[PDB]
Amino acid sequence: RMKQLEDKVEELLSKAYHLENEVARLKKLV
Amino acid sequence: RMKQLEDKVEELLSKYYHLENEVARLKKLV
Amino acid sequence: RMKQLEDKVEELLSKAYHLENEVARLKKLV
Ligand code: NA
Ligand code: NA
Ligand code: NA
Ligand code: NA
Ligand code: NA
Ligand code: NA
Ligand code: NA
């Protein structure tokens, strides 16, 4: 149950921090 | 347990919407 | 609350993926 969705939320957290940076890239160059 | 998960998924739910706006805005700006 | 949680991160993982795609698209327009 919960160790499965925690590692998903972990994955989610990583992704969010990833995309956040990407958007910063785009915005500073666009 | 389930407290911290719903906690973080709201962080994530809002992060993800926030990004969707940045992407929408950025699409207009290219 | 457990099942709603697991399905909520479902949407998140899937929106995470389309943001990667839409931010990848915007990369070579800027
Ligand atoms: Na996996
Ligand atoms: Na509550
Ligand atoms: Na936090
Ligand atoms: Na969207
Ligand atoms: Na996924
Ligand atoms: Na992935
Ligand atoms: Na790049």
Side-chain angles (χ1 to χ4, degrees), chain C residues 1-2 4 6-7 9 11 13-15 20 23-24 28 30:
Chain C
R1 12 173 34 75
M2 188 70 66
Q4 293 101 290
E6 313 166 324
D7 311 305
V9 317
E11 336 180 11
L13 294 158
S14 275
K15 294 178 118 159
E20 282 160 357
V23 85
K28 62 226 70 164
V30 162

Side-chain angles (χ1 to χ4, degrees), chain B residues 4-9 11-28:
Chain B
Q4 291 94 26
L5 292 156
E6 313 162 325
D7 260 339
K8 275 58 182 84
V9 307
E11 283 179 45
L12 278 160
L13 207 57
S14 300
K15 294 201 189 320
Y16 278 43
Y17 167 66
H18 189 45
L19 299 151
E20 287 180 336
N21 282 346
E22 309 299 284
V23 173
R25 299 171 213 187
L26 276 158
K27 270 152 88 201
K28 286 278 138 54

